[PDB]
Amino acid sequence: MTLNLCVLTPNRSIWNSEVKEIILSTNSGQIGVLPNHAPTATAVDIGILRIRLNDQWLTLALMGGFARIGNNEITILVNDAERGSDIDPQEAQQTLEIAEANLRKAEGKRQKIEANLALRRARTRVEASNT
Amino acid sequence: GLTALTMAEYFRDVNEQDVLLFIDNIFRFVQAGSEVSALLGRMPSAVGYQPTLSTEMGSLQERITSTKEGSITSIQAVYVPADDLTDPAPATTFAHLDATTVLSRGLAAKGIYPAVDPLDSTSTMLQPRIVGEEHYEIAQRVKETLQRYKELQDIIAILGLDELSEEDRLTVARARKIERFLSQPFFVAEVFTGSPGKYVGLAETIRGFQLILSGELDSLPEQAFYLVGNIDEATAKAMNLEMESKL
Amino acid sequence: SVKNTQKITEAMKLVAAAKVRRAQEAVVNGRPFSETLVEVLYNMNEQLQTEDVDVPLTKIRTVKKVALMVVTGDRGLCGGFNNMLLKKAESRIAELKKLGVDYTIISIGKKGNTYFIRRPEIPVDRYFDGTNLPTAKEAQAIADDVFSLFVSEEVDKVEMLYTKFVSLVKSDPVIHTLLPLSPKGEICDINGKCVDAAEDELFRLTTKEGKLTVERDMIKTETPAFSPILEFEQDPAQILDALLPLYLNSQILRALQESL
Amino acid sequence: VSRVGSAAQIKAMKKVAGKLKLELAQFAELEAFAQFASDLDKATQNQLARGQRLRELLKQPQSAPLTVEEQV
């Protein structure tokens, strides 16, 4: 009734557990997943990889990555993933305002993509408000 | 010392039997020589032992000789002052000793009785023309194995017994087996623990160490060699442990 | 004093061996991710045979301005390590001052960057540090920095100076060109020893007759071509566009773990 | 060292001071890793911390007599 989810990370295996529903957000859309999904390949980018296991809709904030979603065995190549409640509300929101202090700095194309990645850190920060 | 020496020399040259002198630490004998020479006023020598130090200690330890009647082999504790082989009293003593076996405190605390250290102990008899070619080979191989284990005691803490290479995992296993097999129960320890006590001939321990180090007994457990006599008795211990393994 | 020094240096030898083993354990933790990444990348290269108009991280069309990024070891007494590293760095920046490249330097070592902050004759800017384990957040910081540097084409042919772990006595410092990334998957060298990926090198340290030495493992992961049907969610381009960043990050984290 | 050894101690000391001597020996062996214990193996860390606490068991005030019923 579940898929062998193994979300990876360059030095870890963040959430190695089986999940009913997978709501990883790609570039185009937040493609929901049920068991026995068809073999595809999603470029999961910024966005919470919300997962609805039998317990709850436990959220995990991933920064960036990619997901080769086969059949019942999904393996996701996340850059940085924070499962469950590893991140906490107050510090996350304050660092989100720090990210806003970052975004408006300067310097054309060279640093505005760094400001974009700081905005994506703020997107990681919005996850701690959801719990 | 000389009293014990003549009391043993009568045994030697009257009953033609092997005598053992357990002269307690020679440094007390040399100390007493220094005391009596400083009392006689004879001008002291180097560091402060008597001038007739070599002559006196040689007169004590030259009547320790295997005469045609019988051997009078002695066993002399030696206590180095300030732990140096350099000063005259341990120098003039180690000029005479023919086999030096140290009893190691850490090994004694471990419980590998007898506590005699297998590595740091040495003897001038160990050479092949004296012992036997196979005895020299197996003794040098056991000393190299225990050297390997004294080295890898550093690393088996970090890497573990499995991570390191399995060509010397055999070395570590046989090293544990040797370090245990060296422990022998005594005919004297019966009053303390209750083990009967086994006398192990030279041939028996030679063949046992050859079987342990050659590679046959790589399957017997490590605690089957601890406090056992002949190697077949160690196999008997292991077979009894195998009998009780099911229960 | 000499006896206490002997005890202390024996303790530091033991602690350094345990730290080497824990860094190897972090690399073996990472090897699932690297294997899955180096097989999915081939799966993409097989579904599309480099049919692409994408990935600004593949602008190798000139060698205008190189960013040699030199990671170094960051402690005291540093074996004979930091001097060798920054020596090869100085030789390479001299050769890049010949061609007229205007090289910038991203330094990752604390001792290395404190050295670089003395002499600015070498243009060195934006130096960071991470030690005792390369954390994925520091790897993300370095990835974001050099990534934002490559999206603006001012930074090109962005090679790195990490010392691959060939042996325990001395490991020669090698230099890898990073940011082109060769979307075929090959993260190759300084043009004369380029290597294919999915043929990795994972160091496993094991004892010899008696000593401690590192024995290389040139293990080969076999890459599954594609699942039977293999439908495709995103565009043919955006997949590699979003996948090459994390591959860059994995190579940076590997050249930080093996450098450490 | 003491030549008599544990033949002098009472049975309570014979049971407890054995572990005390063993743990102080191990802590003196690990006295080189006193500060350099950097997130090492938990056996090493726990043993070193217990040894560091054991030496402050050892130290005691001036002219303070510990009757055996307390020191055991």
Side-chain angles (χ1 to χ4, degrees), chain A residues 10 28 39-40 63 66 68 79 110 113-114 117, chain C residues 30 40 43 140 144 148 154 230-231 233-234 249:
Chain A
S28 50
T40 60
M63 288 287 299
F66 170 88
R68 170 186 176 70
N79 176 98
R110 312 153 175 80
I113 304 311
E114 205 269 348
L117 265 298
Chain C
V40 165
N43 172 34
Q140 178 211 330
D144 285 348
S148 280
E154 64 174 9
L230 194 92
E231 318 178 328
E233 196 268 330
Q234 288 291 120
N249 172 276

mmCIF file with all atom_site columns, all heavy atoms in Angstrom, chain A residues 10 28 39-40 63 66 68 79 110 113-114 117, chain C residues 30 40 43 140 144 148 154 230-231 233-234 249:
data_model
loop_
_atom_site.group_PDB
_atom_site.id
_atom_site.type_symbol
_atom_site.label_atom_id
_atom_site.label_alt_id
_atom_site.label_comp_id
_atom_site.label_asym_id
_atom_site.label_entity_id
_atom_site.label_seq_id
_atom_site.pdbx_PDB_ins_code
_atom_site.Cartn_x
_atom_site.Cartn_y
_atom_site.Cartn_z
_atom_site.occupancy
_atom_site.B_iso_or_equiv
_atom_site.pdbx_formal_charge
_atom_site.auth_seq_id
_atom_site.auth_comp_id
_atom_site.auth_asym_id
_atom_site.auth_atom_id
_atom_site.pdbx_PDB_model_num
ATOM 1   N N   . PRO A 1 10  ? 23.744 14.297 -0.881  1.00 0.00 ? 10  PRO A N   1
ATOM 2   C CA  . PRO A 1 10  ? 25.165 13.995 -1.129  1.00 0.00 ? 10  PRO A CA  1
ATOM 3   C C   . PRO A 1 10  ? 25.974 13.401 0.020   1.00 0.00 ? 10  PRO A C   1
ATOM 4   O O   . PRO A 1 10  ? 27.068 12.883 -0.221  1.00 0.00 ? 10  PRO A O   1
ATOM 5   C CB  . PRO A 1 10  ? 25.721 15.366 -1.521  1.00 0.00 ? 10  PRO A CB  1
ATOM 6   C CG  . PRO A 1 10  ? 24.608 15.970 -2.283  1.00 0.00 ? 10  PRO A CG  1
ATOM 7   C CD  . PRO A 1 10  ? 23.330 15.508 -1.615  1.00 0.00 ? 10  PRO A CD  1
ATOM 8   N N   . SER A 1 28  ? 7.036  22.517 -13.102 1.00 0.00 ? 28  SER A N   1
ATOM 9   C CA  . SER A 1 28  ? 5.742  22.805 -13.714 1.00 0.00 ? 28  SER A CA  1
ATOM 10  C C   . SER A 1 28  ? 4.613  22.754 -12.691 1.00 0.00 ? 28  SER A C   1
ATOM 11  O O   . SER A 1 28  ? 3.773  23.660 -12.645 1.00 0.00 ? 28  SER A O   1
ATOM 12  C CB  . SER A 1 28  ? 5.475  21.827 -14.858 1.00 0.00 ? 28  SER A CB  1
ATOM 13  O OG  . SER A 1 28  ? 5.678  20.488 -14.441 1.00 0.00 ? 28  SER A OG  1
ATOM 14  N N   . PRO A 1 39  ? 6.267  4.690  -14.319 1.00 0.00 ? 39  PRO A N   1
ATOM 15  C CA  . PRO A 1 39  ? 7.685  5.085  -14.310 1.00 0.00 ? 39  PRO A CA  1
ATOM 16  C C   . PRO A 1 39  ? 7.920  6.356  -15.113 1.00 0.00 ? 39  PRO A C   1
ATOM 17  O O   . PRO A 1 39  ? 7.731  6.391  -16.331 1.00 0.00 ? 39  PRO A O   1
ATOM 18  C CB  . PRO A 1 39  ? 8.390  3.877  -14.937 1.00 0.00 ? 39  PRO A CB  1
ATOM 19  C CG  . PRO A 1 39  ? 7.350  3.235  -15.779 1.00 0.00 ? 39  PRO A CG  1
ATOM 20  C CD  . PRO A 1 39  ? 6.063  3.416  -15.031 1.00 0.00 ? 39  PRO A CD  1
ATOM 21  N N   . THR A 1 40  ? 8.338  7.410  -14.411 1.00 0.00 ? 40  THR A N   1
ATOM 22  C CA  . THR A 1 40  ? 8.614  8.708  -15.010 1.00 0.00 ? 40  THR A CA  1
ATOM 23  C C   . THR A 1 40  ? 9.881  9.258  -14.372 1.00 0.00 ? 40  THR A C   1
ATOM 24  O O   . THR A 1 40  ? 10.620 8.539  -13.697 1.00 0.00 ? 40  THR A O   1
ATOM 25  C CB  . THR A 1 40  ? 7.451  9.701  -14.826 1.00 0.00 ? 40  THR A CB  1
ATOM 26  O OG1 . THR A 1 40  ? 7.211  9.915  -13.433 1.00 0.00 ? 40  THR A OG1 1
ATOM 27  C CG2 . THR A 1 40  ? 6.168  9.193  -15.465 1.00 0.00 ? 40  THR A CG2 1
ATOM 28  N N   . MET A 1 63  ? 15.632 21.652 -0.550  1.00 0.00 ? 63  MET A N   1
ATOM 29  C CA  . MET A 1 63  ? 16.082 22.849 -1.251  1.00 0.00 ? 63  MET A CA  1
ATOM 30  C C   . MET A 1 63  ? 16.015 22.660 -2.762  1.00 0.00 ? 63  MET A C   1
ATOM 31  O O   . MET A 1 63  ? 15.333 23.418 -3.460  1.00 0.00 ? 63  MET A O   1
ATOM 32  C CB  . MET A 1 63  ? 17.499 23.215 -0.811  1.00 0.00 ? 63  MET A CB  1
ATOM 33  C CG  . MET A 1 63  ? 17.579 23.765 0.603   1.00 0.00 ? 63  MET A CG  1
ATOM 34  S SD  . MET A 1 63  ? 16.934 25.440 0.742   1.00 0.00 ? 63  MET A SD  1
ATOM 35  C CE  . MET A 1 63  ? 18.030 26.326 -0.360  1.00 0.00 ? 63  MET A CE  1
ATOM 36  N N   . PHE A 1 66  ? 16.225 16.368 -7.726  1.00 0.00 ? 66  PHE A N   1
ATOM 37  C CA  . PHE A 1 66  ? 15.699 15.620 -8.859  1.00 0.00 ? 66  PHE A CA  1
ATOM 38  C C   . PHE A 1 66  ? 15.138 14.310 -8.326  1.00 0.00 ? 66  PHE A C   1
ATOM 39  O O   . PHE A 1 66  ? 15.597 13.804 -7.302  1.00 0.00 ? 66  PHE A O   1
ATOM 40  C CB  . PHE A 1 66  ? 16.785 15.358 -9.912  1.00 0.00 ? 66  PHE A CB  1
ATOM 41  C CG  . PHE A 1 66  ? 16.372 14.398 -10.981 1.00 0.00 ? 66  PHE A CG  1
ATOM 42  C CD1 . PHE A 1 66  ? 15.720 14.850 -12.112 1.00 0.00 ? 66  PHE A CD1 1
ATOM 43  C CD2 . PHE A 1 66  ? 16.631 13.046 -10.858 1.00 0.00 ? 66  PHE A CD2 1
ATOM 44  C CE1 . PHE A 1 66  ? 15.334 13.972 -13.097 1.00 0.00 ? 66  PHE A CE1 1
ATOM 45  C CE2 . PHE A 1 66  ? 16.233 12.168 -11.826 1.00 0.00 ? 66  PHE A CE2 1
ATOM 46  C CZ  . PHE A 1 66  ? 15.596 12.628 -12.955 1.00 0.00 ? 66  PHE A CZ  1
ATOM 47  N N   . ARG A 1 68  ? 13.874 10.445 -9.725  1.00 0.00 ? 68  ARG A N   1
ATOM 48  C CA  . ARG A 1 68  ? 13.570 9.372  -10.670 1.00 0.00 ? 68  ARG A CA  1
ATOM 49  C C   . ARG A 1 68  ? 12.526 8.475  -10.021 1.00 0.00 ? 68  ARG A C   1
ATOM 50  O O   . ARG A 1 68  ? 12.832 7.621  -9.188  1.00 0.00 ? 68  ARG A O   1
ATOM 51  C CB  . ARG A 1 68  ? 14.825 8.597  -11.051 1.00 0.00 ? 68  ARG A CB  1
ATOM 52  C CG  . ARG A 1 68  ? 14.524 7.333  -11.847 1.00 0.00 ? 68  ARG A CG  1
ATOM 53  C CD  . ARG A 1 68  ? 15.767 6.489  -12.086 1.00 0.00 ? 68  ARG A CD  1
ATOM 54  N NE  . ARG A 1 68  ? 15.476 5.228  -12.768 1.00 0.00 ? 68  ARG A NE  1
ATOM 55  C CZ  . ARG A 1 68  ? 15.100 5.118  -14.039 1.00 0.00 ? 68  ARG A CZ  1
ATOM 56  N NH1 . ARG A 1 68  ? 14.962 6.195  -14.797 1.00 0.00 ? 68  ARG A NH1 1
ATOM 57  N NH2 . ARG A 1 68  ? 14.864 3.920  -14.556 1.00 0.00 ? 68  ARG A NH2 1
ATOM 58  N N   . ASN A 1 79  ? 19.406 17.953 -3.072  1.00 0.00 ? 79  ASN A N   1
ATOM 59  C CA  . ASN A 1 79  ? 20.617 18.618 -2.602  1.00 0.00 ? 79  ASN A CA  1
ATOM 60  C C   . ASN A 1 79  ? 20.625 18.729 -1.080  1.00 0.00 ? 79  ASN A C   1
ATOM 61  O O   . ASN A 1 79  ? 21.584 18.313 -0.418  1.00 0.00 ? 79  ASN A O   1
ATOM 62  C CB  . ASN A 1 79  ? 20.716 19.999 -3.254  1.00 0.00 ? 79  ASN A CB  1
ATOM 63  C CG  . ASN A 1 79  ? 21.892 20.805 -2.753  1.00 0.00 ? 79  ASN A CG  1
ATOM 64  O OD1 . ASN A 1 79  ? 22.946 20.851 -3.386  1.00 0.00 ? 79  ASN A OD1 1
ATOM 65  N ND2 . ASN A 1 79  ? 21.726 21.428 -1.596  1.00 0.00 ? 79  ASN A ND2 1
ATOM 66  N N   . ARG A 1 110 ? 25.467 38.544 -11.515 1.00 0.00 ? 110 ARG A N   1
ATOM 67  C CA  . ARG A 1 110 ? 26.374 37.714 -10.726 1.00 0.00 ? 110 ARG A CA  1
ATOM 68  C C   . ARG A 1 110 ? 25.781 37.360 -9.368  1.00 0.00 ? 110 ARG A C   1
ATOM 69  O O   . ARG A 1 110 ? 25.878 36.209 -8.924  1.00 0.00 ? 110 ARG A O   1
ATOM 70  C CB  . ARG A 1 110 ? 27.714 38.425 -10.548 1.00 0.00 ? 110 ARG A CB  1
ATOM 71  C CG  . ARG A 1 110 ? 28.287 38.985 -11.832 1.00 0.00 ? 110 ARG A CG  1
ATOM 72  C CD  . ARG A 1 110 ? 29.180 40.185 -11.566 1.00 0.00 ? 110 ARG A CD  1
ATOM 73  N NE  . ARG A 1 110 ? 29.825 40.658 -12.787 1.00 0.00 ? 110 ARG A NE  1
ATOM 74  C CZ  . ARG A 1 110 ? 29.236 41.431 -13.694 1.00 0.00 ? 110 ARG A CZ  1
ATOM 75  N NH1 . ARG A 1 110 ? 27.982 41.825 -13.520 1.00 0.00 ? 110 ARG A NH1 1
ATOM 76  N NH2 . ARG A 1 110 ? 29.900 41.812 -14.776 1.00 0.00 ? 110 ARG A NH2 1
ATOM 77  N N   . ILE A 1 113 ? 21.343 35.813 -8.770  1.00 0.00 ? 113 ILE A N   1
ATOM 78  C CA  . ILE A 1 113 ? 21.022 34.390 -8.687  1.00 0.00 ? 113 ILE A CA  1
ATOM 79  C C   . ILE A 1 113 ? 21.339 33.858 -7.294  1.00 0.00 ? 113 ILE A C   1
ATOM 80  O O   . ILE A 1 113 ? 20.651 32.967 -6.778  1.00 0.00 ? 113 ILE A O   1
ATOM 81  C CB  . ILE A 1 113 ? 21.750 33.610 -9.796  1.00 0.00 ? 113 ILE A CB  1
ATOM 82  C CG1 . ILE A 1 113 ? 21.394 34.194 -11.165 1.00 0.00 ? 113 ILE A CG1 1
ATOM 83  C CG2 . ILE A 1 113 ? 21.376 32.136 -9.757  1.00 0.00 ? 113 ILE A CG2 1
ATOM 84  C CD1 . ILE A 1 113 ? 19.904 34.394 -11.385 1.00 0.00 ? 113 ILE A CD1 1
ATOM 85  N N   . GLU A 1 114 ? 22.361 34.420 -6.644  1.00 0.00 ? 114 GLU A N   1
ATOM 86  C CA  . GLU A 1 114 ? 22.578 34.121 -5.232  1.00 0.00 ? 114 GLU A CA  1
ATOM 87  C C   . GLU A 1 114 ? 21.422 34.642 -4.385  1.00 0.00 ? 114 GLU A C   1
ATOM 88  O O   . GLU A 1 114 ? 21.003 33.996 -3.418  1.00 0.00 ? 114 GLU A O   1
ATOM 89  C CB  . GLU A 1 114 ? 23.905 34.719 -4.766  1.00 0.00 ? 114 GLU A CB  1
ATOM 90  C CG  . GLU A 1 114 ? 24.521 34.008 -3.575  1.00 0.00 ? 114 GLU A CG  1
ATOM 91  C CD  . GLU A 1 114 ? 24.082 34.602 -2.254  1.00 0.00 ? 114 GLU A CD  1
ATOM 92  O OE1 . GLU A 1 114 ? 23.494 35.702 -2.263  1.00 0.00 ? 114 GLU A OE1 1
ATOM 93  O OE2 . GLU A 1 114 ? 24.328 33.970 -1.207  1.00 0.00 ? 114 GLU A OE2 1
ATOM 94  N N   . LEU A 1 117 ? 18.735 32.150 -4.737  1.00 0.00 ? 117 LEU A N   1
ATOM 95  C CA  . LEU A 1 117 ? 18.931 30.992 -3.867  1.00 0.00 ? 117 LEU A CA  1
ATOM 96  C C   . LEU A 1 117 ? 18.653 31.344 -2.408  1.00 0.00 ? 117 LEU A C   1
ATOM 97  O O   . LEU A 1 117 ? 18.216 30.491 -1.626  1.00 0.00 ? 117 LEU A O   1
ATOM 98  C CB  . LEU A 1 117 ? 20.343 30.434 -4.040  1.00 0.00 ? 117 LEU A CB  1
ATOM 99  C CG  . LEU A 1 117 ? 20.478 29.283 -5.044  1.00 0.00 ? 117 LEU A CG  1
ATOM 100 C CD1 . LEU A 1 117 ? 19.654 28.081 -4.595  1.00 0.00 ? 117 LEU A CD1 1
ATOM 101 C CD2 . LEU A 1 117 ? 20.102 29.699 -6.462  1.00 0.00 ? 117 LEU A CD2 1
ATOM 102 N N   . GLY C 2 30  ? 27.953 8.966  1.163   1.00 0.00 ? 30  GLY C N   1
ATOM 103 C CA  . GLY C 2 30  ? 27.653 9.669  -0.065  1.00 0.00 ? 30  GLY C CA  1
ATOM 104 C C   . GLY C 2 30  ? 27.596 8.818  -1.318  1.00 0.00 ? 30  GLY C C   1
ATOM 105 O O   . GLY C 2 30  ? 26.948 9.217  -2.289  1.00 0.00 ? 30  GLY C O   1
ATOM 106 N N   . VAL C 2 40  ? 21.534 8.054  -13.293 1.00 0.00 ? 40  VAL C N   1
ATOM 107 C CA  . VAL C 2 40  ? 20.451 8.848  -13.861 1.00 0.00 ? 40  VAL C CA  1
ATOM 108 C C   . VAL C 2 40  ? 20.977 9.789  -14.938 1.00 0.00 ? 40  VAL C C   1
ATOM 109 O O   . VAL C 2 40  ? 20.304 10.041 -15.946 1.00 0.00 ? 40  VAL C O   1
ATOM 110 C CB  . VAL C 2 40  ? 19.721 9.608  -12.741 1.00 0.00 ? 40  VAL C CB  1
ATOM 111 C CG1 . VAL C 2 40  ? 18.853 10.695 -13.319 1.00 0.00 ? 40  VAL C CG1 1
ATOM 112 C CG2 . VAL C 2 40  ? 18.881 8.646  -11.917 1.00 0.00 ? 40  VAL C CG2 1
ATOM 113 N N   . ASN C 2 43  ? 21.210 7.845  -17.953 1.00 0.00 ? 43  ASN C N   1
ATOM 114 C CA  . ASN C 2 43  ? 19.859 7.590  -18.446 1.00 0.00 ? 43  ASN C CA  1
ATOM 115 C C   . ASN C 2 43  ? 19.344 8.780  -19.252 1.00 0.00 ? 43  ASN C C   1
ATOM 116 O O   . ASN C 2 43  ? 18.706 8.613  -20.300 1.00 0.00 ? 43  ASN C O   1
ATOM 117 C CB  . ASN C 2 43  ? 18.930 7.274  -17.273 1.00 0.00 ? 43  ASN C CB  1
ATOM 118 C CG  . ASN C 2 43  ? 17.470 7.195  -17.681 1.00 0.00 ? 43  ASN C CG  1
ATOM 119 O OD1 . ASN C 2 43  ? 17.137 6.764  -18.783 1.00 0.00 ? 43  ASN C OD1 1
ATOM 120 N ND2 . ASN C 2 43  ? 16.591 7.613  -16.784 1.00 0.00 ? 43  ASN C ND2 1
ATOM 121 N N   . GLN C 2 140 ? 26.299 23.566 -0.017  1.00 0.00 ? 140 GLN C N   1
ATOM 122 C CA  . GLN C 2 140 ? 25.308 24.369 -0.722  1.00 0.00 ? 140 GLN C CA  1
ATOM 123 C C   . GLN C 2 140 ? 25.774 25.809 -0.868  1.00 0.00 ? 140 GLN C C   1
ATOM 124 O O   . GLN C 2 140 ? 25.526 26.442 -1.896  1.00 0.00 ? 140 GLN C O   1
ATOM 125 C CB  . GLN C 2 140 ? 23.967 24.320 0.009   1.00 0.00 ? 140 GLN C CB  1
ATOM 126 C CG  . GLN C 2 140 ? 22.881 25.173 -0.636  1.00 0.00 ? 140 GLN C CG  1
ATOM 127 C CD  . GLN C 2 140 ? 21.894 25.734 0.367   1.00 0.00 ? 140 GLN C CD  1
ATOM 128 O OE1 . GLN C 2 140 ? 21.630 25.127 1.404   1.00 0.00 ? 140 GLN C OE1 1
ATOM 129 N NE2 . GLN C 2 140 ? 21.346 26.906 0.066   1.00 0.00 ? 140 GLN C NE2 1
ATOM 130 N N   . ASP C 2 144 ? 26.174 27.353 -4.471  1.00 0.00 ? 144 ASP C N   1
ATOM 131 C CA  . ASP C 2 144 ? 25.438 28.554 -4.848  1.00 0.00 ? 144 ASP C CA  1
ATOM 132 C C   . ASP C 2 144 ? 26.383 29.654 -5.302  1.00 0.00 ? 144 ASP C C   1
ATOM 133 O O   . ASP C 2 144 ? 26.122 30.334 -6.299  1.00 0.00 ? 144 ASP C O   1
ATOM 134 C CB  . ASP C 2 144 ? 24.585 29.032 -3.674  1.00 0.00 ? 144 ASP C CB  1
ATOM 135 C CG  . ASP C 2 144 ? 23.362 28.169 -3.458  1.00 0.00 ? 144 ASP C CG  1
ATOM 136 O OD1 . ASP C 2 144 ? 23.055 27.339 -4.339  1.00 0.00 ? 144 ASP C OD1 1
ATOM 137 O OD2 . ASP C 2 144 ? 22.706 28.321 -2.408  1.00 0.00 ? 144 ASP C OD2 1
ATOM 138 N N   . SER C 2 148 ? 26.192 30.782 -9.129  1.00 0.00 ? 148 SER C N   1
ATOM 139 C CA  . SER C 2 148 ? 25.875 32.158 -9.488  1.00 0.00 ? 148 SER C CA  1
ATOM 140 C C   . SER C 2 148 ? 27.041 32.810 -10.215 1.00 0.00 ? 148 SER C C   1
ATOM 141 O O   . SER C 2 148 ? 26.853 33.742 -11.006 1.00 0.00 ? 148 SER C O   1
ATOM 142 C CB  . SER C 2 148 ? 25.514 32.951 -8.231  1.00 0.00 ? 148 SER C CB  1
ATOM 143 O OG  . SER C 2 148 ? 24.178 32.699 -7.835  1.00 0.00 ? 148 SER C OG  1
ATOM 144 N N   . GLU C 2 154 ? 31.178 35.719 -17.004 1.00 0.00 ? 154 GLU C N   1
ATOM 145 C CA  . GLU C 2 154 ? 32.488 36.238 -16.612 1.00 0.00 ? 154 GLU C CA  1
ATOM 146 C C   . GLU C 2 154 ? 33.376 35.146 -16.020 1.00 0.00 ? 154 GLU C C   1
ATOM 147 O O   . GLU C 2 154 ? 34.603 35.196 -16.156 1.00 0.00 ? 154 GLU C O   1
ATOM 148 C CB  . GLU C 2 154 ? 32.321 37.385 -15.613 1.00 0.00 ? 154 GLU C CB  1
ATOM 149 C CG  . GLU C 2 154 ? 31.694 36.971 -14.291 1.00 0.00 ? 154 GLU C CG  1
ATOM 150 C CD  . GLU C 2 154 ? 31.678 38.085 -13.271 1.00 0.00 ? 154 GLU C CD  1
ATOM 151 O OE1 . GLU C 2 154 ? 32.005 39.233 -13.636 1.00 0.00 ? 154 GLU C OE1 1
ATOM 152 O OE2 . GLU C 2 154 ? 31.351 37.807 -12.099 1.00 0.00 ? 154 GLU C OE2 1
ATOM 153 N N   . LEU C 2 230 ? 9.508  4.452  -19.451 1.00 0.00 ? 230 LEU C N   1
ATOM 154 C CA  . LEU C 2 230 ? 10.267 5.666  -19.139 1.00 0.00 ? 230 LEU C CA  1
ATOM 155 C C   . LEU C 2 230 ? 9.603  6.916  -19.728 1.00 0.00 ? 230 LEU C C   1
ATOM 156 O O   . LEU C 2 230 ? 10.123 7.567  -20.636 1.00 0.00 ? 230 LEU C O   1
ATOM 157 C CB  . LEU C 2 230 ? 11.724 5.543  -19.603 1.00 0.00 ? 230 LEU C CB  1
ATOM 158 C CG  . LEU C 2 230 ? 12.679 6.601  -19.045 1.00 0.00 ? 230 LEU C CG  1
ATOM 159 C CD1 . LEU C 2 230 ? 13.336 6.107  -17.769 1.00 0.00 ? 230 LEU C CD1 1
ATOM 160 C CD2 . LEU C 2 230 ? 13.716 7.015  -20.076 1.00 0.00 ? 230 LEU C CD2 1
ATOM 161 N N   . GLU C 2 231 ? 8.418  7.229  -19.209 1.00 0.00 ? 231 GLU C N   1
ATOM 162 C CA  . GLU C 2 231 ? 7.785  8.502  -19.522 1.00 0.00 ? 231 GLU C CA  1
ATOM 163 C C   . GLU C 2 231 ? 8.614  9.654  -18.953 1.00 0.00 ? 231 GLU C C   1
ATOM 164 O O   . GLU C 2 231 ? 9.485  9.465  -18.101 1.00 0.00 ? 231 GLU C O   1
ATOM 165 C CB  . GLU C 2 231 ? 6.359  8.536  -18.975 1.00 0.00 ? 231 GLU C CB  1
ATOM 166 C CG  . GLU C 2 231 ? 5.601  7.230  -19.175 1.00 0.00 ? 231 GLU C CG  1
ATOM 167 C CD  . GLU C 2 231 ? 4.201  7.260  -18.595 1.00 0.00 ? 231 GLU C CD  1
ATOM 168 O OE1 . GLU C 2 231 ? 3.991  7.942  -17.571 1.00 0.00 ? 231 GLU C OE1 1
ATOM 169 O OE2 . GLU C 2 231 ? 3.310  6.592  -19.162 1.00 0.00 ? 231 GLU C OE2 1
ATOM 170 N N   . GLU C 2 233 ? 8.491  13.681 -17.485 1.00 0.00 ? 233 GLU C N   1
ATOM 171 C CA  . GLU C 2 233 ? 7.586  14.679 -16.920 1.00 0.00 ? 233 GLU C CA  1
ATOM 172 C C   . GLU C 2 233 ? 7.914  16.082 -17.428 1.00 0.00 ? 233 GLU C C   1
ATOM 173 O O   . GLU C 2 233 ? 7.068  16.741 -18.045 1.00 0.00 ? 233 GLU C O   1
ATOM 174 C CB  . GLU C 2 233 ? 7.626  14.602 -15.394 1.00 0.00 ? 233 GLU C CB  1
ATOM 175 C CG  . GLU C 2 233 ? 6.474  15.295 -14.673 1.00 0.00 ? 233 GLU C CG  1
ATOM 176 C CD  . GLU C 2 233 ? 6.779  16.734 -14.301 1.00 0.00 ? 233 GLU C CD  1
ATOM 177 O OE1 . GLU C 2 233 ? 7.962  17.048 -14.065 1.00 0.00 ? 233 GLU C OE1 1
ATOM 178 O OE2 . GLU C 2 233 ? 5.834  17.550 -14.241 1.00 0.00 ? 233 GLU C OE2 1
ATOM 179 N N   . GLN C 2 234 ? 9.131  16.556 -17.188 1.00 0.00 ? 234 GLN C N   1
ATOM 180 C CA  . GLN C 2 234 ? 9.543  17.898 -17.579 1.00 0.00 ? 234 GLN C CA  1
ATOM 181 C C   . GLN C 2 234 ? 9.957  17.940 -19.045 1.00 0.00 ? 234 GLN C C   1
ATOM 182 O O   . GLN C 2 234 ? 9.789  16.979 -19.801 1.00 0.00 ? 234 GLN C O   1
ATOM 183 C CB  . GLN C 2 234 ? 10.690 18.394 -16.698 1.00 0.00 ? 234 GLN C CB  1
ATOM 184 C CG  . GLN C 2 234 ? 10.278 18.728 -15.290 1.00 0.00 ? 234 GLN C CG  1
ATOM 185 C CD  . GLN C 2 234 ? 9.393  19.956 -15.236 1.00 0.00 ? 234 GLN C CD  1
ATOM 186 O OE1 . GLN C 2 234 ? 8.253  19.886 -14.782 1.00 0.00 ? 234 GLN C OE1 1
ATOM 187 N NE2 . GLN C 2 234 ? 9.922  21.093 -15.679 1.00 0.00 ? 234 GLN C NE2 1
ATOM 188 N N   . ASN C 2 249 ? 27.319 20.078 -7.099  1.00 0.00 ? 249 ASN C N   1
ATOM 189 C CA  . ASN C 2 249 ? 27.387 20.063 -5.643  1.00 0.00 ? 249 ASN C CA  1
ATOM 190 C C   . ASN C 2 249 ? 27.974 18.757 -5.129  1.00 0.00 ? 249 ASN C C   1
ATOM 191 O O   . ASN C 2 249 ? 28.733 18.752 -4.155  1.00 0.00 ? 249 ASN C O   1
ATOM 192 C CB  . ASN C 2 249 ? 26.003 20.297 -5.048  1.00 0.00 ? 249 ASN C CB  1
ATOM 193 C CG  . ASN C 2 249 ? 25.976 20.099 -3.553  1.00 0.00 ? 249 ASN C CG  1
ATOM 194 O OD1 . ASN C 2 249 ? 25.851 18.978 -3.064  1.00 0.00 ? 249 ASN C OD1 1
ATOM 195 N ND2 . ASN C 2 249 ? 26.095 21.193 -2.814  1.00 0.00 ? 249 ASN C ND2 1
#
